[PDB]
Coordinates of C-alpha atoms in Angstrom, one line a residue:
Chain U
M1 CA -0.2 0.1 -0.1
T2 CA 1.1 3.2 -0.9
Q3 CA -0.5 7.0 -0.7
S4 CA 0.8 9.9 -2.7
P5 CA 0.7 12.5 -2.7
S6 CA 2.1 12.7 1.3
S7 CA 1.6 16.5 1.4
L8 CA 0.2 18.9 -0.9
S9 CA -1.4 22.8 -1.0
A10 CA -3.8 24.6 -2.7
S11 CA -5.8 27.2 -3.0
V12 CA -9.5 28.0 -1.2
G13 CA -12.4 26.6 -4.0
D14 CA -10.2 23.9 -5.6
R15 CA -10.0 20.4 -7.0
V16 CA -8.1 18.3 -4.8
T17 CA -7.6 14.7 -5.5
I18 CA -5.7 11.5 -3.1
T19 CA -4.6 8.2 -4.8
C20 CA -4.1 5.5 -2.7
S21 CA -3.1 2.2 -4.7
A22 CA -3.3 -1.1 -3.9
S23 CA -6.1 -7.3 -4.0
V24 CA -8.6 -5.0 -2.1
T25 CA -12.1 -4.4 -1.3
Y26 CA -13.2 -1.3 -0.1
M27 CA -11.5 1.6 1.0
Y28 CA -12.5 4.2 3.5
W29 CA -11.5 7.3 3.8
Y30 CA -10.3 9.7 8.1
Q31 CA -9.6 13.0 8.6
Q32 CA -7.5 14.1 10.9
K33 CA -7.0 17.6 12.3
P34 CA -4.9 18.6 14.8
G35 CA -5.2 17.7 17.9
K36 CA -8.1 15.5 17.7
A37 CA -9.4 11.8 16.8
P38 CA -9.3 11.0 13.3
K39 CA -13.0 11.0 11.8
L40 CA -14.5 8.3 8.7
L41 CA -15.4 10.3 5.6
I42 CA -15.8 8.2 3.4
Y43 CA -16.7 4.3 3.5
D44 CA -17.0 1.2 1.3
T45 CA -14.9 2.9 -0.9
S46 CA -17.3 5.9 -2.6
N47 CA -20.2 6.6 0.0
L48 CA -20.5 9.9 2.5
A49 CA -20.7 8.9 5.9
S50 CA -23.2 10.7 7.8
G51 CA -23.2 14.7 8.2
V52 CA -19.9 14.9 5.4
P53 CA -20.5 18.1 2.4
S54 CA -21.4 16.5 -0.6
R55 CA -18.0 18.4 -1.4
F56 CA -16.0 14.8 -1.2
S57 CA -15.8 11.3 -3.2
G58 CA -14.6 8.8 -3.2
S59 CA -13.6 6.0 -6.1
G60 CA -12.3 3.1 -7.0
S61 CA -11.1 -0.2 -8.7
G62 CA -9.9 -3.5 -8.3
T63 CA -6.4 -1.6 -6.9
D64 CA -6.1 2.3 -7.7
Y65 CA -8.7 4.8 -6.1
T66 CA -9.1 8.6 -5.1
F67 CA -10.2 10.4 -2.4
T68 CA -11.8 13.4 -4.2
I69 CA -12.7 17.4 -2.4
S70 CA -14.0 19.5 -5.7
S71 CA -13.3 22.8 -3.5
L72 CA -11.1 23.2 -0.7
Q73 CA -11.8 24.7 2.0
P74 CA -10.4 26.0 5.2
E75 CA -11.5 23.8 7.2
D76 CA -10.5 20.9 5.1
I77 CA -6.8 21.4 6.4
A78 CA -5.7 18.5 7.9
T79 CA -4.7 15.4 7.3
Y80 CA -6.2 12.0 5.3
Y81 CA -5.5 8.7 6.0
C82 CA -6.7 5.5 3.6
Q83 CA -7.3 2.8 5.0
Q84 CA -8.0 -0.8 2.8
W85 CA -10.2 -3.5 4.1
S86 CA -10.6 -6.9 3.0
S87 CA -10.3 -10.1 4.4
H88 CA -11.6 -10.1 8.3
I89 CA -8.3 -7.5 7.7
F90 CA -7.3 -2.8 8.1
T91 CA -4.8 -1.8 7.6
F92 CA -4.3 2.3 7.4
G93 CA -1.8 4.1 4.6
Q94 CA 0.1 7.1 5.2
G95 CA -0.2 9.8 5.1
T96 CA -2.2 13.2 3.5
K97 CA -1.1 16.3 5.1
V98 CA -3.8 19.2 3.6
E99 CA -2.8 22.1 4.0
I100 CA -4.6 26.0 2.6
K101 CA -2.3 28.0 -0.2
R102 CA -2.5 31.8 0.4
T103 CA -1.3 35.4 0.8
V104 CA 2.1 35.5 2.7
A105 CA 2.1 37.2 5.0
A106 CA 4.0 37.7 7.4
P107 CA 4.9 36.8 11.2
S108 CA 4.3 38.8 14.0
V109 CA 7.6 38.6 16.4
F110 CA 6.9 38.9 20.1
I111 CA 9.3 37.2 22.7
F112 CA 9.6 36.8 26.6
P113 CA 11.8 37.7 29.3
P114 CA 12.1 34.9 32.4
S115 CA 10.3 34.4 34.5
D116 CA 10.7 36.1 37.8
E117 CA 10.2 32.3 39.1
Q118 CA 12.0 29.9 36.7
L119 CA 15.6 32.7 37.5
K120 CA 15.2 32.2 41.3
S121 CA 15.0 27.9 40.7
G122 CA 18.9 28.2 38.4
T123 CA 17.7 29.0 35.5
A124 CA 16.0 31.3 32.7
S125 CA 14.3 30.4 29.1
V126 CA 13.8 33.0 27.0
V127 CA 10.3 32.6 24.3
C128 CA 10.6 33.9 21.4
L129 CA 7.3 34.0 18.9
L130 CA 6.1 34.4 15.4
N131 CA 3.1 34.7 14.9
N132 CA 0.6 34.1 12.3
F133 CA 2.6 33.8 9.3
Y134 CA 2.3 31.6 5.6
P135 CA 3.9 30.5 4.0
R136 CA 5.6 27.7 7.1
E137 CA 9.6 28.7 6.0
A138 CA 10.9 31.1 8.8
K139 CA 14.9 31.0 10.2
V140 CA 14.7 31.4 13.5
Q141 CA 18.4 33.0 15.6
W142 CA 19.6 33.4 18.5
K143 CA 21.9 35.5 20.0
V144 CA 23.4 37.0 23.4
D145 CA 25.9 40.2 23.7
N146 CA 26.1 39.5 19.6
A147 CA 26.7 36.0 20.0
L148 CA 25.2 33.4 17.4
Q149 CA 23.1 30.2 20.1
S150 CA 24.1 27.4 19.3
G151 CA 21.9 24.2 20.8
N152 CA 20.8 25.1 24.5
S153 CA 17.2 25.7 22.4
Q154 CA 14.4 24.4 21.2
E155 CA 11.4 24.7 18.6
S156 CA 8.2 24.0 17.6
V157 CA 5.2 25.2 15.3
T158 CA 1.4 24.8 15.1
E159 CA -0.3 22.6 12.1
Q160 CA -2.2 25.4 9.6
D161 CA -4.5 27.4 11.3
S162 CA -7.3 26.6 9.6
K163 CA -9.4 30.1 10.7
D164 CA -7.1 31.8 9.2
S165 CA -5.0 29.5 7.4
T166 CA -1.0 31.0 9.4
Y167 CA 1.0 29.0 10.9
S168 CA 2.6 30.0 14.3
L169 CA 6.0 29.2 15.9
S170 CA 7.4 29.1 19.6
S171 CA 11.9 29.3 20.6
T172 CA 12.5 28.8 24.1
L173 CA 16.0 29.2 24.2
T174 CA 17.8 27.9 27.9
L175 CA 20.7 29.5 29.6
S176 CA 21.1 28.7 33.9
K177 CA 20.8 31.5 36.0
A178 CA 25.3 32.5 36.3
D179 CA 25.2 32.6 32.4
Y180 CA 22.2 34.8 32.1
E181 CA 23.5 37.3 35.1
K182 CA 26.6 37.3 32.9
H183 CA 25.2 39.0 29.3
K184 CA 22.9 41.4 28.7
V185 CA 21.3 40.9 25.6
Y186 CA 18.5 38.5 24.5
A187 CA 17.5 38.6 20.8
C188 CA 16.4 36.1 18.4
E189 CA 16.6 37.1 14.7
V190 CA 13.5 36.1 11.9
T191 CA 13.8 35.5 8.4
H192 CA 10.2 34.9 6.8
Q193 CA 9.1 36.0 2.6
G194 CA 6.4 38.4 4.4
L195 CA 8.9 40.4 6.5
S196 CA 10.9 43.5 4.5
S197 CA 14.0 43.0 6.8
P198 CA 15.3 40.8 9.9
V199 CA 13.5 41.5 12.5
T200 CA 14.8 41.6 15.4
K201 CA 13.5 41.5 18.6
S202 CA 15.3 41.7 21.9
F203 CA 15.6 42.6 26.0
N204 CA 17.4 43.8 27.5
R205 CA 19.4 41.6 30.6
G206 CA 20.6 39.7 33.8
Chain I
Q1 CA -25.0 11.0 21.3
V2 CA -23.2 8.4 22.1
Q3 CA -19.9 9.2 23.1
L4 CA -16.6 7.2 24.0
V5 CA -14.3 7.7 26.9
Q6 CA -11.3 6.3 27.3
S7 CA -8.6 6.1 29.9
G8 CA -5.6 8.4 31.0
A9 CA -1.6 8.3 30.1
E10 CA 0.4 5.3 31.0
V11 CA 3.4 5.0 31.8
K12 CA 4.7 1.4 31.8
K13 CA 8.1 -0.4 32.0
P14 CA 9.6 -3.4 29.0
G15 CA 8.5 -5.7 29.7
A16 CA 5.1 -4.9 31.8
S17 CA 1.5 -5.2 30.9
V18 CA -0.8 -1.7 30.1
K19 CA -4.6 -1.6 30.1
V20 CA -6.8 0.7 28.8
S21 CA -10.5 1.4 29.3
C22 CA -13.5 2.9 27.2
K23 CA -17.0 3.9 28.4
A24 CA -19.8 4.6 25.8
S25 CA -20.9 7.2 28.0
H26 CA -21.6 -3.0 15.4
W27 CA -18.2 -3.8 16.4
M28 CA -15.9 -1.8 18.1
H29 CA -12.1 -1.0 17.8
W30 CA -9.3 -0.8 19.0
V31 CA -6.7 0.9 17.1
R32 CA -3.8 3.0 18.0
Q33 CA -1.5 5.5 16.9
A34 CA 2.4 4.8 17.3
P35 CA 5.0 6.4 17.0
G36 CA 6.2 5.7 12.8
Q37 CA 4.0 3.3 12.8
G38 CA 1.6 5.3 11.5
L39 CA -2.3 4.3 12.4
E40 CA -2.2 0.7 12.4
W41 CA -5.1 -1.6 13.4
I42 CA -5.1 -4.3 16.5
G43 CA -8.6 -6.0 16.9
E44 CA -12.5 -6.0 16.7
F45 CA -15.2 -6.9 19.0
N46 CA -18.7 -7.3 19.3
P47 CA -19.9 -5.2 22.3
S48 CA -22.6 -7.9 22.7
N49 CA -20.6 -11.1 23.7
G50 CA -17.4 -10.4 23.6
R51 CA -16.3 -12.4 20.4
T52 CA -13.0 -10.8 19.3
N53 CA -10.9 -11.0 15.9
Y54 CA -7.4 -9.6 16.1
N55 CA -5.3 -8.3 14.3
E56 CA -2.3 -11.5 13.8
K57 CA 0.9 -9.1 15.3
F58 CA -1.0 -8.1 18.7
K59 CA -2.5 -11.4 18.9
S60 CA 0.3 -12.9 20.8
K61 CA 0.7 -9.3 23.2
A62 CA -3.3 -7.9 22.6
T63 CA -6.9 -9.3 25.3
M64 CA -10.1 -7.3 24.7
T65 CA -12.8 -8.1 26.7
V66 CA -16.0 -6.8 27.1
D67 CA -17.8 -5.7 29.9
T68 CA -21.7 -5.5 29.0
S69 CA -23.0 -4.9 32.0
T70 CA -21.0 -1.5 33.0
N71 CA -21.1 -1.0 29.2
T72 CA -16.8 -0.2 29.6
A73 CA -14.7 -2.4 27.0
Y74 CA -10.9 -2.5 27.3
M75 CA -7.2 -4.1 26.1
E76 CA -4.6 -5.4 27.5
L77 CA -1.3 -4.9 26.4
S78 CA 1.3 -6.8 27.4
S79 CA 5.4 -8.1 27.1
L80 CA 5.5 -4.1 26.3
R81 CA 8.9 -3.0 24.3
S82 CA 9.4 0.5 22.9
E83 CA 7.5 0.1 19.3
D84 CA 3.8 0.0 21.4
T85 CA 4.7 3.9 22.9
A86 CA 1.3 4.6 20.8
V87 CA -2.1 7.0 21.8
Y88 CA -4.5 3.2 21.9
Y89 CA -8.1 5.1 20.3
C90 CA -10.9 2.4 21.4
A91 CA -13.4 3.1 17.7
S92 CA -16.9 2.0 16.4
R93 CA -19.1 2.8 13.6
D94 CA -23.4 3.1 13.5
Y95 CA -25.3 4.2 11.0
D96 CA -27.3 7.8 11.1
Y97 CA -31.7 7.8 10.6
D98 CA -31.2 7.6 7.3
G99 CA -29.2 4.8 6.7
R100 CA -25.7 6.8 6.3
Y101 CA -22.7 4.9 7.6
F102 CA -21.0 7.5 10.4
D103 CA -17.7 6.1 14.0
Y104 CA -17.1 7.4 16.7
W105 CA -14.1 7.2 18.4
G106 CA -12.7 7.9 21.7
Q107 CA -10.3 10.9 23.0
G108 CA -7.3 8.0 23.2
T109 CA -4.8 6.9 25.5
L110 CA -1.2 7.5 24.7
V111 CA 0.7 4.8 26.4
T112 CA 4.3 5.8 27.2
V113 CA 6.7 2.3 27.0
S114 CA 9.8 4.0 29.1
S115 CA 12.8 2.9 32.0
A116 CA 13.5 6.4 32.8
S117 CA 11.5 8.7 35.7
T118 CA 8.5 9.8 35.7
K119 CA 8.5 13.9 36.3
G120 CA 6.2 16.2 37.2
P121 CA 6.5 19.9 34.9
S122 CA 7.5 23.3 36.0
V123 CA 5.7 25.9 34.7
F124 CA 6.3 28.7 34.3
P125 CA 4.1 32.3 32.5
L126 CA 5.4 33.8 30.0
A127 CA 3.8 37.7 30.8
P128 CA 2.1 40.1 28.0
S129 CA 4.4 43.1 28.0
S130 CA 5.2 46.0 25.4
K131 CA 7.0 43.0 24.0
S132 CA 3.9 40.6 23.1
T133 CA 1.6 43.8 21.5
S134 CA 0.6 43.6 17.6
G135 CA -1.4 45.9 17.3
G136 CA -4.6 45.8 19.9
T137 CA -3.6 42.0 20.6
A138 CA -1.3 40.7 23.3
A139 CA 0.0 37.3 23.5
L140 CA 0.0 35.2 27.0
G141 CA 1.3 32.3 28.0
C142 CA 2.8 29.7 30.3
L143 CA 6.1 27.5 29.0
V144 CA 5.7 24.0 30.5
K145 CA 9.3 22.3 31.3
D146 CA 11.2 19.2 32.7
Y147 CA 8.9 17.3 32.7
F148 CA 8.0 13.7 31.7
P149 CA 6.6 11.4 29.8
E150 CA 3.3 12.7 27.1
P151 CA 1.1 14.1 27.6
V152 CA 0.4 17.4 29.2
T153 CA -2.6 19.2 28.6
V154 CA -2.7 22.6 29.1
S155 CA -6.7 24.5 29.2
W156 CA -6.8 28.1 30.5
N157 CA -8.8 30.0 33.1
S158 CA -12.3 28.0 33.7
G159 CA -11.5 25.5 31.1
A160 CA -13.7 27.0 28.0
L161 CA -11.3 29.4 26.9
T162 CA -10.1 28.2 22.9
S163 CA -10.7 30.2 20.8
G164 CA -6.8 32.0 20.5
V165 CA -5.1 29.5 22.4
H166 CA -1.6 27.5 20.8
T167 CA -0.5 24.7 22.5
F168 CA 3.3 23.8 20.6
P169 CA 3.8 20.4 19.4
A170 CA 6.0 18.7 22.7
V171 CA 9.9 19.4 22.5
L172 CA 12.9 17.4 23.4
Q173 CA 15.0 19.4 25.8
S174 CA 19.4 18.8 26.4
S175 CA 18.3 16.8 29.5
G176 CA 15.3 15.0 27.4
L177 CA 12.5 15.4 30.0
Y178 CA 10.5 17.0 27.8
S179 CA 9.0 21.0 27.2
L180 CA 6.1 22.7 25.6
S181 CA 4.5 26.3 25.6
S182 CA 0.4 27.1 25.3
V183 CA -0.2 31.0 24.1
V184 CA -3.4 32.6 23.9
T185 CA -3.6 35.6 22.4
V186 CA -6.5 38.8 24.4
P187 CA -7.9 41.9 22.8
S188 CA -5.4 44.5 24.4
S189 CA -7.6 45.6 26.7
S190 CA -8.9 42.4 28.5
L191 CA -5.4 42.7 30.4
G192 CA -6.1 44.9 32.4
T193 CA -8.9 43.9 33.8
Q194 CA -9.4 39.4 33.1
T195 CA -6.7 36.7 35.0
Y196 CA -5.4 34.3 33.0
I197 CA -4.4 30.4 34.2
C198 CA -2.9 27.9 32.8
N199 CA -3.9 25.0 34.1
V200 CA -1.2 21.9 33.5
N201 CA -2.2 18.1 33.9
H202 CA -0.4 16.1 33.6
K203 CA -1.5 11.9 34.4
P204 CA 2.0 10.2 34.9
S205 CA 2.7 11.9 37.3
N206 CA -0.6 13.1 39.0
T207 CA -0.2 15.4 38.9
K208 CA -2.3 19.6 38.0
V209 CA -0.5 22.1 37.8
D210 CA -2.6 25.8 38.3
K211 CA -0.4 29.6 37.2
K212 CA -1.3 32.4 36.4
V213 CA 0.1 35.3 33.8
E214 CA 0.5 38.0 35.6
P215 CA 1.9 41.0 32.4
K216 CA 5.0 42.4 33.5
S217 CA 7.3 45.5 31.8

């Protein structure tokens, strides 16, 4: 079994098609939105589940099966899975991530100084937040007294938000209290398509 | 109005056993979503009598039981290994008033298979400031650090504040403990008046943390 594509990007209103190859009797299609449990959209190949919009469809024969969204909506942002059935026997495809293509939107860049409570416990985390950007690609660099950092830092990004088709990103830089107190300037520097130049968000002290 | 509810997150040692329950508040299914492996079918059971049909891979290690008088289904996995770390789901199907099939799933139970010790979370405020405002909207949240294992679940205030909340996927620290962040965007004017509290629930350590998030300048 293979399911393709594994990720796809399309505009609102676009028709979108996923295929899932190969001794199968029926294909089922599931939707998994961020973080929920999966939800059956298409069953016995071609049949829409209860309360599923008419813009979804399914078809297939023998080895080749298709799942179509005829007019992609932001609410359709999700990972989709085929699932073949025979034989008392259920196996799932690999997944297809479905993203909305939108206009470029620059991140709002925020910074969070370490909390007092943390500082008293012997450590110091700075948090840099990039909010509501598209597309997903960004460069985030941490700088302490102008010195580029590696690795006391982590990062993670939300899956695409259905309400505006954007992503957000959180990044943590973590030092000891002792190290934090020896330096003055704390900065995250951010590059993104929708930004007119690199934005530095910073603060002093320690 | 049928809903499936599962027991809480578990951490077990390799070679140990775990039992996940599924209560109902068509044959039913146990499915897992694992690291790397994707969605994996485990087996099915007749909720009316407890007859079972397992996926081959799972026949030896898994046992499915039904208690029809409480409407509770159980799945026990034995001889646990690292590959068994996964979210385990119970699920069923039915049909609506005019014959369309649908399904419904439990919320899932994360089972972590590890010999490492359980560590409850450190919860710190991400304080709203001039440096977290974008016009009209301010961001604030909470940084959850040094916990093990997953999951930590974050809710805000009374737990009915969900719009504008972003809870980031868990990351690994330099120590190999886990960290995440939850961030809420709010109208700037509300910072005056509303008190914001992140409620961090770590079921594996039987710990909840309630942290107030105060603005900073």
